[PDB]
């Protein structure tokens, strides 16, 4: 989900935020 | 958004490759950027064209094999075929250049270094070719990234537009979850964009990895497969470690949810906890939950820190194994081959670090396509379009048989309905008779089996729930219609909206939420009428418009509007109140979907049918202070120094292993004479060194020491960060739990609850990871710079200018990048609000046929949200390109310095420098990326620390006056002497000069108006808030000389609302476990609760959830008094223990209270004058003053008494209903 094998590759111009969409 | 043509469409290959337009925009910005400065979405990226193309492709694919085996993956591939093919070709070129350049150039440079003759021209060609290849590959990667971003943006826009268009024509609106529908049109687009981007980036690993494997096999020989075997044995282990970390985080999520629920339960009833002195038990439970979460986080960090930094470790381990095996067998090894293999291993590590996110993106894309295909197969709604025989008839159905859809559920059979223009027709029936079925059928939500239905014109629909639009009073009422003064005034006056306008100071421009936060049911119903009136459709449909409305205002609105304005238009009325059909034109009764009696009102009354029966039935940037605070909380400077020392030790061990390899290569034969034929001479061969085993053992020991140090450093860092988190948790819990409740009164518990939840989850999930990654990257960069500068002392003269250039680039980039992110979320809130509002009112929009304006607004919002995101991605790519160019210049400078000094240094040192220079690619970008996300958590740390030093301190637990007496209170005598009470500063006084005496064994009933101060007696008796004047004496001892712990241990208060903490029944009675079983059983049987408890198999171990919603209300209240009995307090106060409960239950509760505490004083704070009769004395409060103090027997005998007047008023209110 957020291991080093994933966030390091997306650090080339991709936002570090998946959804942050849950509401009330 | 203000532009003529998008600069992307007017940019050449070089301009788009280097992103010159965004560089100019950033230079223009460099203190803030607004939406008027950014450019709008390009024409080629417009949502309309992409949505139309996607819809055409989907329609073409549907009519190929049928709507049963069509996959959206094929449609996406067809849509993006050209762009993805171009991206694949560009990435092939990039990988080919990145494999051909560094390895071949390093081999050629190191081969020339070993040559005796020196050439000043051949090396220049090599370095020029290396620089050209690096520039070409970087530019191709930039172009690939730009094309992928454009393709992803287009695909996201098209798919979101198609999803919104499909949802607007959904038949079964309630079939899908409310959250799922919003998530489909909100989160899925970003998932598709990222998935497409990293899937285009996917084809970079398997090609270059195989190329490097082949090159290593060709160069080294049969021993080149060792690195491949190491990679195959290592990377799946990292994947398994990641899976285990995810599995542990799965339980961590549940643990955090449980902790959050416990914190919410604690904060919800904080007043009760303070008044009951049960802080210790809840604190212990919270501590146990926190320690369980700490253990889970320790396991997660232990299973997570392994894969944080593994590429250099994997490279070094593979090099160690390969070189040791190759050299021990007696073969020959040279510096050039070894360093080429090292660089190729670095390339494989980069590729296999990029690949896992590509695999995850592919999985996410598959999930997204499956979810989208699940929704796209839903049934669509249909509209009635046929015309009647004559314009006179508006509604005409002949024996129509219609059924529900979910399969067909028949509800209407042989329907013969004919309604003319200008005739008011009402529908009568019971629940399930088919009144709602007719409303659903006339809209067009039912299928036709037999007969035909004639519909002319549109309909005006009013929702029972009164759905509202996220706008003001003016916007939603017009509903897109033209604004006129007289019509609006008449509509407002007809529905009696004047009180609503008077209540709201800015009712004309008052914003309303999605469902309505400052509106009532009647106001919502009235607004519905107003909107429908403005709509002014030919046919009016009323689905219970006066249900929640009061009778008087509903009848007034009916007479003023329906009987006057709608006299010449068709009106359909459906309601449960049949008294409004007396003046209606036609009456229709619905019963089981079959028409039995219909006609006029008098005919229906004369027929004496079921209608008559029911009628007569109803008639009756953060500063360094945050960093210092975090360092201090981590364990002081010692922990920081230890962590830094361990990190430097690991990095230095890796560097020392590499340097020892270089030293071993440089050593050679060590001036040893060997025989190679007829003559003996010194030969430069590493296989002739007699210290083979010594070097091999040192190399293996260095590798093992590096691994052990890395593991120890990871474990120590995880332990330190978790200890800091635990220290922060305990400190924050202690600060809040001891602060006065005035903070709770001023700031709602929701704010602190959200702060706790979000901040703690975010920090415990991200901060150790980001900190470890940033520290590792920074130390690796520093070591790489130092080692190159160590061999060449002149390397700093080029580093310096490059350092200041990098700092300048970071300064400029830190403003634009952080500004575009804010603008991206600025328009996201209107986007989410519009998405939520449309789904909550889909039926109303479908009835009003307003599916085009909403779609256009959605498209506009999608474009206005996609443009800043595209600009931000382009800026990120530009920054990455600049950092890559800086690294390329560094590598070129290193190579140029290497070339000039050939023949003066051993080739091993030059190879080491050129190998460490290659690894510098990507490290600068990683360091820059992690320097912005770490700060995002330090602001949360600062927010947490804000409440740490802001909360005040309450009264001390132990008062220096000591305990008054071991048996205090000696009796139950209380006295008041000029009691002064105020809630807060500058607030009006609640109690002013009130003094009274209460004799032992007396029943006192306090009754008064709201705000008199009746509820303030309990607050002042418990010393909840320090008194502003006067003194209170209890048994001859002043209350203020007794500590809070001792004062509350001998007084009892019954809460107004039954409270049941989650956990166990025993834990809800005495968590500290001070009482024995027999006393608890006697207390339970005193309130007749023994039978209801012993019946369960877990009488003392029964599970109680939140609010205790598993017993009856009376059982909960009885348990409440049973709990209040355990403390054995001589003073008891009752405050409104009855609220909407049956009669005999309250009688039993009253008799149980009377019999249980006959020996305890009573202070009854009740508003019902009937329940206070029979007490010893009656207390009356008049705005904080006492006027009457005597027995109720003489109070009711005086007509001038205020208590008698209140009792008479209550009796009149009870008697008159009316």
Author numbering:
A (entry chain B): 46 to 69
B (entry chain A): 94 to 123, 126 to 501, 573 to 786, 840 to 1437
Give excerpts from the publication.
Human multidrug resistance protein 5 (hMRP5) effluxes anticancer and antivirus drugs, driving multidrug resistance. To uncover the mechanism of hMRP5, we determine six distinct cryo-EM structures, revealing an autoinhibitory N-terminal peptide that must dissociate to permit subsequent substrate recruitment. Human MRP5 was demonstrated to play a critical function in regulating cellular cyclic GMP (cGMP) homeostasis, which is essential for many physiological processes, including the maintenance of vascular smooth muscle tone and cardiac contractility. hMRP5 also influences signaling transduction pathways and may contribute to drug resistance in anticancer and antivirus therapy. From a clinical oncology perspective, hMRP5 can directly contribute to cancer drug resistance through the efflux of many anticancer drugs, such as methotrexate, cisplatin, purine analogs, pyrimidine analogs, doxorubicin, and antifolates from cells.
Results showed that D35C-E75C had the highest affinity for hMRP5 among these peptides. Moreover, the D35C-E75C peptide displayed a higher binding affinity to hMRP5 than the well-studied substrate doxorubicin and inhibitor trequinsin. To assess if D35C-E75C can structurally block the transport pathway, we incubated it with hMRP5-Δ1-94 at a 2:1 ratio for in vitro reconstitution. The resulting high-resolution structure of the reconstituted complex maintained an inward-open conformation with both NBDs separated. Importantly, we observed clear EM density for the bound D35C-E75C peptide in the central cavity, resembling the endogenous C46-S64 fragment in wt-hMRP5. Given its ability to effectively occlude the binding pocket, we termed the D35C-E75C peptide MRP5 potential peptide inhibitor (M5PI). Further structural analysis revealed that despite lacking phosphorylated Ser60, M5PI adopted nearly identical conformation to C46-S64 when bound in the central pocket. Additionally, beyond the C46-S64-derived density, extra EM density corresponding to Met65-Leu69 was observed, indicating these flanking residues also contact the transmembrane helices. Like the native sequence, M5PI forms an integrated network of hydrophobic, electrostatic, and hydrogen bond interactions to stably bind hMRP5. The segment from Cys46 to Arg70 showed clear density within the central cavity of hMRP5, whereas the rest of the Cys35-Cys75 peptide demonstrated greater flexibility, evidenced by its weaker density.
